[PDB]
Amino acid sequence: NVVITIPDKTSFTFHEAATSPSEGEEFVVGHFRELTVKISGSSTSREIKFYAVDENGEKTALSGTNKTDFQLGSSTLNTNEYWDFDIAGLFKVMFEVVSVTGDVTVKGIVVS
Amino acid sequence: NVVITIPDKTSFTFHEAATSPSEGEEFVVGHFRELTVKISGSSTSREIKFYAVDENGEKTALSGTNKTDFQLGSSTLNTNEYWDFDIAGLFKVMFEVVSVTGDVTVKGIVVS
Amino acid sequence: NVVITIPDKTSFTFHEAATSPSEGEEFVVGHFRELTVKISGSSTSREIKFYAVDENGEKTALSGTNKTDFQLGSSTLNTNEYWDFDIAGLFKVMFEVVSVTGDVTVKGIVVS
Amino acid sequence: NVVITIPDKTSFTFHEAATSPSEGEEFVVGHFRELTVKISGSSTSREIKFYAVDENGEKTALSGTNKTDFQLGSSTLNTNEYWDFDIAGLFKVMFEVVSVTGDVTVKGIVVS
Amino acid sequence: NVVITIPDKTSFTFHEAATSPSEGEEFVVGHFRELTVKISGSSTSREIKFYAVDENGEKTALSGTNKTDFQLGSSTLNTNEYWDFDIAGLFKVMFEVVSVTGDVTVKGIVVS
């Protein structure tokens, strides 16, 4: 029995147009394996910190890979970036806006 | 229950025989995970820039891997090359012909 | 025949609030491929050693990847960390509390 | 609904007992993802060049990984070697015997 | 149509209690992708060489990754070690006991 395999995917908004600091919305990983976050908006400065969160709400800095230059990091000071993360073994993920001047949007696509 | 698994694949033409600068056709990623782009044609010079595009049309430089030498890059000045990309968490991808003297074809095979 | 594929996942507690040295509970890998361990609690100091265990009970130091900084290691002196392991070819895994001052929890999520 | 997943595999002969230069047979990749080539025989010298080939017949040097030493390359002067390739995004692959003294066999196993 | 995916696994004994030099038993890869070999026993010295074997019985040194320290190698002088191999494109694999004083067991778990 041969089957053609495709992943499940969904979208999630962590921040829809943050203009002040916030932890934003937390994604429950469920059955997904990978996350790509897009950082967008018209800010002139910002800092986003990337976090894994467990069932008790403890936050742990989470490294991912920048799709522009393959750099590794657990935060960014830039906008117009995609960051890839391996999330399969995590309960929840969170993308904190530490600081922003203007507006920053943080949205993800998750893949099983 | 044991199943033999195979990927879904399709072909996509970004540029059929570009002779002038163009963003070309955008590929909506859908359920796919990986893309291999072939840059072909007959040219003296050409420049192809690789982009991810979000739902608002923002373009982000996208790095891939050259199958000939495993070099990383988000653009190329060469023809007769395959470039591999991880696209699973992206909305769309675009391969811009910034310039061509002669003609350049840009075609992909996508894999789930 | 097209199928959407998702992994199996489960959770496992190696140590539910260790305050003295212990090997803790051993996880039978079964059909799983990957493990992510979270080291948590309010301990002021601890040492966790990571082990693969075979069917005869022989323990072998097992390296994994720290999700905060991508560092490799077979042990840690830190709390609030995730460690990723490729376990597909192992019979059992074990996370030994070698030492602790305070309480340390060791819990994993496994993925097929 | 839980399924046990296994790949499709097949074998392909690029060269059965080449004693003079030849492009040999081309493999149409179809639904396969990976290729491992064995270079065998009693030749005393040879040069094999590894190619991806598109729908127009353009040949592109294709790097793979030597399973003995993890070296990368797009050709070999050696015999008794396995080379692994990621082929999922390619139309065809070809292994050219550029030169040979004696007999060289080039056979692959492909995996979905 | 959504399915939860798990691998096929199997076990294989290359050597059950080798006390003198032997090539041991050959595993036919079949539909499997990844192999983890455990080297165990009470030997005080030993040398194990790792091989791929083709349909004609030709042996090729095969590199794998030590799970304790991520070191690469095609042989070992140590006991109490796991070695991981990518075997998907191989016909057969063999683990030769070149020498041993005492007993060495060589067993694998294989994953699709």
Side-chain angles (χ1 to χ4, degrees):
Chain A
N1 219 72
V2 177
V3 296
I4 297 166
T5 59
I6 67 172
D8 193 33
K9 296 184 181 182
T10 198
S11 295
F12 189 74
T13 296
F14 298 95
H15 293 272
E16 189 57 53
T19 62
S20 62
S22 183
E23 288 180 326
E25 303 298 316
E26 299 179 318
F27 181 71
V28 175
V29 170
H31 62 225
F32 289 104
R33 297 173 187 273
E34 306 180 304
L35 165 68
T36 301
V37 173
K38 177 62 196 296
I39 298 165
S40 65
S42 294
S43 67
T44 59
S45 301
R46 79 304 299 172
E47 182 174 30
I48 311 299
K49 285 188 192 301
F50 314 153
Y51 291 107
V53 183
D54 71 8
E55 291 88 338
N56 297 138
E58 184 174 45
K59 295 161 60 175
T60 310
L62 175 67
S63 285
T65 305
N66 183 327
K67 296 187 79 73
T68 291
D69 58 10
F70 293 126
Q71 291 300 290
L72 307 181
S74 56
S75 62
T76 187
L77 302 182
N78 294 135
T79 190
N80 190 20
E81 291 184 327
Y82 290 95
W83 288 90
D84 282 346
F85 301 87
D86 172 9
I87 62 167
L90 299 182
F91 176 65
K92 275 177 181 178
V93 292
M94 165 195 295
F95 288 83
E96 178 169 6
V97 177
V98 177
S99 62
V100 57
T101 300
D103 62 293
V104 63
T105 290
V106 183
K107 291 179 173 171
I109 296 172
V110 290
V111 184
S112 70
Chain B
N1 218 79
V2 175
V3 299
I4 293 160
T5 59
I6 64 170
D8 193 30
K9 301 189 184 177
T10 203
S11 296
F12 187 80
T13 296
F14 298 93
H15 296 272
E16 186 79 55
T19 62
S20 64
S22 183
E23 287 180 329
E25 302 295 316
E26 294 177 320
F27 180 73
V28 174
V29 170
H31 68 224
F32 293 100
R33 296 172 187 272
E34 302 173 315
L35 167 66
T36 301
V37 175
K38 175 66 193 294
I39 300 168
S40 67
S42 180
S43 62
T44 300
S45 67
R46 78 305 297 174
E47 179 174 32
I48 314 296
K49 286 185 179 171
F50 315 154
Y51 290 111
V53 183
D54 71 11
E55 293 86 340
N56 295 135
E58 185 173 48
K59 294 161 57 173
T60 317
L62 175 65
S63 285
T65 304
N66 181 328
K67 297 184 81 73
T68 295
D69 59 10
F70 293 123
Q71 291 299 292
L72 306 180
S74 60
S75 64
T76 187
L77 299 172
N78 293 124
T79 189
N80 190 22
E81 290 182 329
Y82 291 94
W83 292 86
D84 289 343
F85 302 87
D86 179 357
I87 62 166
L90 301 180
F91 175 62
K92 278 175 175 182
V93 295
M94 165 197 294
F95 290 83
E96 181 169 358
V97 174
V98 176
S99 69
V100 55
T101 293
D103 62 73
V104 63
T105 291
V106 185
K107 290 181 172 168
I109 296 170
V110 291
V111 186
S112 72
Chain C
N1 219 78
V2 177
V3 298
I4 293 159
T5 58
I6 64 170
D8 192 36
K9 301 185 180 180
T10 200
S11 300
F12 188 77
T13 296
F14 300 93
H15 295 271
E16 191 137 293
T19 63
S20 59
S22 182
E23 286 181 330
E25 302 297 316
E26 294 178 318
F27 181 72
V28 174
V29 171
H31 65 221
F32 291 104
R33 299 172 185 271
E34 302 173 312
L35 168 65
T36 299
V37 177
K38 175 66 193 297
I39 296 161
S40 70
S42 290
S43 67
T44 66
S45 63
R46 79 304 298 172
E47 178 181 354
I48 312 298
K49 284 187 148 106
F50 314 155
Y51 289 109
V53 182
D54 74 10
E55 275 191 295
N56 297 133
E58 186 170 47
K59 299 161 53 174
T60 315
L62 176 64
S63 283
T65 306
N66 181 329
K67 296 186 79 74
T68 292
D69 59 10
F70 293 123
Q71 291 301 293
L72 308 180
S74 57
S75 62
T76 186
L77 297 177
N78 295 138
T79 190
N80 190 23
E81 290 182 328
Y82 288 98
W83 289 87
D84 283 347
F85 303 85
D86 175 4
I87 66 167
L90 303 178
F91 172 60
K92 276 176 161 181
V93 293
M94 168 195 291
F95 289 82
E96 179 172 355
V97 174
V98 172
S99 65
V100 58
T101 302
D103 66 288
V104 65
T105 287
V106 184
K107 296 180 170 175
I109 293 170
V110 289
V111 185
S112 74
Chain D
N1 222 80
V2 172
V3 298
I4 294 164
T5 59
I6 64 172
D8 195 31
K9 301 190 182 179
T10 199
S11 300
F12 189 76
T13 296
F14 297 95
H15 298 271
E16 196 103 57
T19 62
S20 61
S22 182
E23 287 189 357
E25 305 302 324
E26 298 173 318
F27 182 69
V28 174
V29 170
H31 62 223
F32 293 103
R33 296 172 186 273
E34 300 176 308
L35 165 68
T36 304
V37 176
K38 174 67 193 295
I39 299 166
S40 66
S42 297
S43 68
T44 62
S45 60
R46 77 308 297 171
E47 179 171 40
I48 314 298
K49 288 186 186 304
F50 317 152
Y51 291 109
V53 183
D54 71 11
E55 286 206 29
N56 300 134
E58 180 171 48
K59 290 173 277 186
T60 313
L62 177 63
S63 285
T65 304
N66 182 325
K67 297 187 78 69
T68 295
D69 61 9
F70 291 124
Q71 293 298 290
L72 311 175
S74 60
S75 64
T76 189
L77 304 177
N78 295 138
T79 193
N80 190 17
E81 292 181 323
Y82 291 95
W83 289 88
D84 283 343
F85 303 87
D86 179 354
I87 65 166
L90 302 180
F91 175 64
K92 277 175 177 177
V93 295
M94 190 263 283
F95 293 78
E96 183 169 2
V97 176
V98 176
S99 58
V100 59
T101 298
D103 63 293
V104 65
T105 291
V106 184
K107 289 181 175 174
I109 295 170
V110 292
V111 186
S112 73
Chain E
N1 221 77
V2 175
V3 299
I4 297 167
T5 61
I6 65 172
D8 195 30
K9 297 189 179 178
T10 200
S11 54
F12 188 78
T13 297
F14 299 96
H15 297 268
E16 186 65 63
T19 61
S20 60
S22 182
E23 288 184 321
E25 303 299 331
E26 303 171 316
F27 179 65
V28 169
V29 171
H31 64 228
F32 291 96
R33 295 173 188 273
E34 169 189 305
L35 169 66
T36 302
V37 176
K38 176 65 195 293
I39 298 165
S40 67
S42 293
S43 68
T44 56
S45 57
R46 80 304 297 173
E47 179 180 358
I48 313 298
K49 285 184 185 175
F50 314 156
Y51 289 111
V53 182
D54 74 8
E55 285 201 19
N56 299 138
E58 183 170 56
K59 294 161 63 170
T60 312
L62 176 65
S63 282
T65 303
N66 182 327
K67 298 187 76 72
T68 289
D69 58 10
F70 292 123
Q71 292 298 291
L72 308 180
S74 59
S75 63
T76 188
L77 297 181
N78 291 138
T79 191
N80 190 23
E81 288 188 325
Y82 294 92
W83 292 84
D84 284 345
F85 301 86
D86 174 4
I87 65 165
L90 299 182
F91 178 64
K92 282 173 175 183
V93 294
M94 159 190 291
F95 289 81
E96 178 171 2
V97 175
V98 173
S99 62
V100 58
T101 302
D103 59 293
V104 63
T105 290
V106 185
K107 292 179 170 174
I109 295 176
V110 210
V111 185
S112 75

